[PDB]
Design a protein. Structure first.
Ligand SMILES: *[C@@H]1O[C@H](CO)[C@@H](O)[C@H](O)[C@H]1NC(C)=O
Lengths: 228, 183
């Protein structure tokens, strides 16, 4: 089985450096691209960049270039990310995630995440931002893209206190093992996620994502509370 | 009348391996002795036929494939091999009935500072089915994000150039290769 295992939590003074690692197992390490996703405390998910471990090439989000450095060590099948000159805006949780291309688009496996604590882009908007439903209702969440993204949209689910887990890639296809009550829909600029007979375990925050071009961008998230 | 092999063996320029070159030669006599002793070959190996008995082969056409790779890659011109060249450029089947000849051509095919005429395919989606030629130059998408014909992160031009200098070790020097394929 695929497993992404990140280094443990870090506490650093302003000015220090941190090199958080992500040890992979379960698959051919050099054949899958690795991304890093930040979640500042109570904030949107943010795609920081990516490294291709075959060649060691990288793409960074302009916001994080020159703050962040992405490397790999093939011999240790380990991806690394170094954050330099830490400011307090950098206190966040950092995830590593795997590009599942070409069998499953977008990020099909995430790491546990590492909390680091210091002391023309495509826009994605979701509605509603917050939602309360009863066991058995269908819930509907929409995502509007500021530009056309064809069907290069994925949805993730983030259960309380855990890493995002993929639900839908390619706008309407389910990741392996995802419950059939989640279906995705839409094309071009308007996407919807539908949960059909909502179960108590669906208590989560749900995010859309476009991967039509770099940088990848996320929606702000839709909190889904389940009354019992 | 003996087979016109010099046209393929002694030709002044050879194809790049990804766009390997194919001559149909027919109604002639393939003789191992004359062919082997015509030059100093570094590899000469036959498959499914007895070298001694090329004269005795009974064939309508012989297919002469030629191209250039580097020394270390010569191993891959053989039935049931794997690697760049065998996967993405030139693939011999397992029921292969023919021969494979090669020789170091550093003196013809290498300039100081580099010869860049010779290219190889580096990325492809599926593997090559035997004797298939792919000369397409489509940008290779390594990630979920589409390339739209433009080159960059996870979006690689699928051909690269050998940089053939005289300085290279014998493994990275050019080798001319001829594959006789009888039917
Ligand atoms: C190539 O030319 C040399 C010199 O004339 C000759 O000895 C050799 O037989 C030629 N090769 C073939 C395949 O005829």
């Amino acid at each position: 089985q695929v497993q992404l295992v990140q280094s443990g939590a870090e506490v650093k003074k302003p000015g220090a450096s941190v090199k958080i690692s992500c040890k992979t197992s379960g698959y051919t390490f050099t054949e899958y691209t690795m991304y890093w996703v930040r979640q500042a405390p109570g904030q949107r998910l943010e795609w920081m960049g990516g490294i291709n471990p075959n060649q060691g090439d990288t793409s960074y989000n302009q916001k994080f270039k020159g703050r962040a450095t992405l490397t790999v060590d093939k011999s240790a099948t380990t991806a690394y990310m170094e954050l330099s000159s830490l400011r307090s805006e950098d206190t966040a949780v950092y995830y590593c995630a795997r590009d599942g291309y070409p069998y499953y688009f977008a990020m099909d496996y995430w790491g546990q995440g590492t909390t680091v604590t210091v002391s023309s882009d495509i826009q994605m908007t979701q509605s509603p931002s917050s939602l309360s439903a009863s066991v058995g209702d269908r819930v509907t969440i929409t995502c509007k893209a500021s530009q056309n993204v064809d069907t290069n949209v994925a949805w993730y689910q983030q259960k309380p206190g855990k890493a995002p887990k993929g639900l839908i890639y390619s706008a309407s296809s389910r990741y392996s093992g995802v419950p059939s009550r989640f279906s995705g829909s839409g094309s071009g600029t308007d996407f919807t996620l539908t949960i059909s007979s909502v179960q108590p375990e669906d208590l989560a925050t749900y995010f859309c994502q476009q991967y039509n071009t770099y940088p990848w961008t996320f929606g702000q998230g839709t909190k889904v509370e389940i009354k019992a | 009348n003996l087979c016109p092999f010099g046209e393929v063996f002694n030709a002044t320029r050879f194809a790049s391996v990804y766009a390997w070159n194919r001559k149909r030669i027919s109604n002639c006599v393939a003789d191992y002795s004359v062919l082997y002793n015509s030059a100093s070959f570094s590899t000469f190996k036959c498959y499914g036929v007895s070298p001694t008995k090329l004269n005795d082969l009974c064939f309508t056409n012989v297919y002469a494939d030629s191209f250039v790779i580097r020394g270390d890659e010569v191993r891959q011109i053989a039935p049931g091999q794997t690697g760049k060249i065998a996967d993405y450029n030139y693939k011999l089947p397992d029921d292969f009935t023919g021969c494979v000849i090669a020789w170091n051509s550093n003196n013809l095919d290498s300039k100081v500072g580099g010869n860049y005429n010779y290219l190889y395919r580096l990325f492809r989606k599926s593997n090559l089915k035997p004797f298939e030629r792919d000369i397409s130059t489509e940008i290779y998408q390594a990630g979920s994000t589409p390339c739209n014909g433009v080159e960059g992160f996870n979006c690689y031009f699928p051909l690269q150039s050998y940089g053939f200098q005289p300085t290279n070790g014998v493994g990275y020097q050019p080798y001319r290769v001829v594959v006789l394929s009888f039917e």
